[PDB]
Amino acid sequence: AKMAFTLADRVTEEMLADKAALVVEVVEENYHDAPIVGIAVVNEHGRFFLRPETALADPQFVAWLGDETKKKSMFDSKRAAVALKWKGIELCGVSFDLLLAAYLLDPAQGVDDVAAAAKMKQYEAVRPDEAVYGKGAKRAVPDEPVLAEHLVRKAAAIWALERPFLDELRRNEQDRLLVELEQPLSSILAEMEFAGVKVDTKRLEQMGEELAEQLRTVEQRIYELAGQEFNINSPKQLGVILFEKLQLPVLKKSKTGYSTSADVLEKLAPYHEIVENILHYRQLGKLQSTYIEGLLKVVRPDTKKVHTIFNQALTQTGRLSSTEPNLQNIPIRLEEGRKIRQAFVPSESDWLIFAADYSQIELRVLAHIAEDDNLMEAFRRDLDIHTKTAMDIFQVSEDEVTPNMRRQAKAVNFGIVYGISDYGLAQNLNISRKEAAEFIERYFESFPGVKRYMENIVQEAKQKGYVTTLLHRRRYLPDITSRNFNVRSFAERMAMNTPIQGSAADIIKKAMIDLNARLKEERLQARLLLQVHDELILEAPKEEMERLCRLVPEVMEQAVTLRVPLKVDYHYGSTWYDAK
DNA sequence: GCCTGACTCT
DNA sequence: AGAGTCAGGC
Numbered sequence: 174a175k176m177a178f179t180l181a182d183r184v185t186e187e188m189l190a191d192k193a194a195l196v197v198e199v200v201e202e203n204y205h206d207a208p209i210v211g212i213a214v215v216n217e218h219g220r221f222f223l224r225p226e227t228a229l230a231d232p233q234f235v236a237w238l239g240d241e242t243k244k245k246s247m248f249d250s251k252r253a254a255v256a257l258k259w260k261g262i263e264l265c266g267v268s269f270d271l272l273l274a275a276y277l278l279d280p281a282q283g284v285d286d287v288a289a290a291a292k293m294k295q296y297e298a299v300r301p302d303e304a305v306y307g308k309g310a311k312r313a314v315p316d317e318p319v320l321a322e323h324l325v326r327k328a329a330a331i332w333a334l335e336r337p338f339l340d341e342l343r344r345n346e347q348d349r350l351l352v353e354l355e356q357p358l359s360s361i362l363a364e365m366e367f368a369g370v371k372v373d374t375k376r377l378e379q380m381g382e383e384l385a386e387q388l389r390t391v392e393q394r395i396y397e398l399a400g401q402e403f404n405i406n407s408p409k410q411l412g413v414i415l416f417e418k419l420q421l422p423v424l425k426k427s428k429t430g431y432s433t434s435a436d437v438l439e440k441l442a443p444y445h446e447i448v449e450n451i452l453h454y455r456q457l458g459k460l461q462s463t464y465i466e467g468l469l470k471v472v473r474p475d476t477k478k479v480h481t482i483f484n485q486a487l488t489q490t491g492r493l494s495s496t497e498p499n500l501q502n503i504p505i506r507l508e509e510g511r512k513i514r515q516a517f518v519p520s521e522s523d524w525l526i527f528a529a530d531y532s533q534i535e536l537r538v539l540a541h542i543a544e545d546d547n548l549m550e551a552f553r554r555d556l557d558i559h560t561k562t563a564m565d566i567f568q569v570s571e572d573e574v575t576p577n578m579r580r581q582a583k584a585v586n587f588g589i590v591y592g593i594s595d596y597g598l599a600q601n602l603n604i605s606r607k608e609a610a611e612f613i614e615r616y617f618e619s620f621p622g623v624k625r626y627m628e629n630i631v632q633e634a635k636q637k638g639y640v641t642t643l644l645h646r647r648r649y650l651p652d653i654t655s656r657n658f659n660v661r662s663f664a665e666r667m668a669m670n671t672p673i674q675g676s677a678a679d680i681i682k683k684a685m686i687d688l689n690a691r692l693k694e695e696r697l698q699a700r701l702l703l704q705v706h707d708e709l710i711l712e713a714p715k716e717e718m719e720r721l722c723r724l725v726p727e728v729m730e731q732a733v734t735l736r737v738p739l740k741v742d743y744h745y746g747s748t749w750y751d752a753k
Numbered sequence: 754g755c756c757t758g759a760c761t762c763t
Numbered sequence: 764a765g766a767g768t769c770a771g772g773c
């Protein structure tokens with residue numbers, strides 16, 4: 174059965190109505206500078222398919238695309254907006270994005286095409302993209318009649334589905350979350366991705382060469398100490414060398430044999446010199462394969478920029494993710510790895526990189542939502558939260574907090590945030606379950622409000638079926654009623670963690686929106702380049718630094734008002750590395 | 754081609 | 764707790 178539509182060869186006025194479902198199809202997973210393979214419009218006057226070489230060269234269609242008062246309903250408008258930016262065309266007036274609507278209604282559905290969103294409301298008159306385009310090697314744009322019918326069915330689905338999605342969003346009290354947060358954020362992310370980040374490829378290559386030399390040296394030491402050559406990057410081959418040839422103790426096994434995970438290796442270190450060398454080899458090898466070679470693979474040779482894609486409709490807690498490359502996991506913890514950041518530079522001469530980050534946003538959020546008196550007071554005094562947590566758990570003065578005590582209190586703070594469990598904490602601090610339970614017990618004695626919150630949120634998740642964040646993002650937790658201890662326990666941790674991690678995600682998203690508006694009002698040339706969960710990275714003329722130093726922290730700090738202050742630290746420099 | 758297990762980040 | 768990428772290997 175084949176849906177009726179006009180296969181148009183020229184644009185007409187009735188295609189330019191002030192309300193329409195719009196499909197601007199980009200089949201390449203990475204949409205940066207990618208082809209647009211077809212366009213479909215469904216509105217009051219009918220259903221239309223347009224070839225892109227026709228539509229995009231029509232002045233009236235382009236004018237309609239960029240006219241803010243002509244409203245469009247779409248799926249994944251950021252994909253279209255970005256593909257259109259590369260062609261020098263502005264997309265405006267997108268008042269409804271079905272991908273973002275589906276994501277807000279239930280992030281666990283993993284909706285990634287119109288068909289999956291449609292299935293949520295018993296609408297099935299549209300094919301999954303994978304059925305049409307195929308998968309992997311055999312992936313391909315089909316012939317025009319098939320392609321056209323597909324885009325029109327997607328448009329028609331968007332047209333039919335807008336009202337029930339908005340209606341449910343409204344009952345969820347998530348209508349503003351879509352309209353005033355996620356959709357405006359989607360435009361901001363499109364600009365960030367399109368702007369891209371400049372890479373000093375010569376610097377990267379130099380680092381690659383030094384790395385290659387050190388890798389060879391560690392590699393040869395490894396063969397020396399094992400008394401033979403083998404594939405160090407083969408967990409199978411390595412396990413044989415470690416646990417059979419060298420007789421190292423077996424403390425952990427994988428599902429598939431011996432575990433050679435990094436924490437297993439740390440413990441083995443005192444037995445044989447080879448172990449530290451393997452850890453080092455693996456550190457350097459990760460830098461080499463992923464942050465030199467992999468990174469250089471995705472730099473555009475023409476502009477020396479990388480253009481990540483932020484997935485805004487993926488994570489279960491409302492964070493963004495980043496791909497091709499992932500710019501949210503660039504090394505920082507170890508100095509040799511952190512040097513990778515010297516290769517990320519401003520895109521114009523006499524510009525600098527500026528980075529601002531919230532300090533302890535998750536614990537500040539927890540203090541607000543739990544209304545824990547002790548925790549709120551700690552932030553009101555702007556104390557070192559880890560030292561203060563140690564003072565309370567160990568019942569000592571600040572003077573008596575040793576480094577090991579602070580380290581352990583820090584670890585409990587992590588656990589408390591992730592949904593605390595004696596097992597997870599024990600694993601982390603290399604201690605017994607009974608020991609870990611005493612820590613948690615001491616914690617809850619010092620922060621009774623936090624304990625009440627943990628109990629109350631788990632009950633609420635049971636009662637309601639979901640938990641929510643500050644700005645009404647929602648996560649359903651059906652395993653919270655499971656009679657399987659481990660399944661139920663995962664869900665209980667999720668109930669505890671999600672309002673924390675998710676409310677922190679909400680706050681920085683709102684900061685981003687506020688920041689973008691302030692930058693425009695101030696006519697600054699500064700631009701957002703990246704978000705890394707609790708931090709924003711910008712580039713700007715060196716002449717705007719002093720202004721950004723006052724502006725960016727204030728905007729981020731005032732994004733929401735909590736029972737405790739938000740605090741933002743900031744730095745700038747000639748490279749991302751230097752913005753520290 | 755998918756999987757596993759290893760690594761990277763907040 | 765939440766993510767993404769890579770080499771080895773089936």
Ligand SMILES: OC[C@H]1O[C@@](CO)(O[C@H]2O[C@H](CO)[C@@H](O)[C@H](O)[C@H]2O)[C@@H](O)[C@@H]1O
Pocket residue numbers: 202203204249252272284285286482484485486487496
């Ligand atoms: O365009 C991003 C948007 O598309 C989806 C599918 O609807 O993901 C596709 O694009 C991502 C970016 O290239 C890929 O990582 C992903 O594999 C691909 O299916 C959504 O998940 C995402 O929000």
Ligand SMILES: [Mg+2]
Pocket residue numbers: 530531532533707
């Ligand atoms: Mg921070």
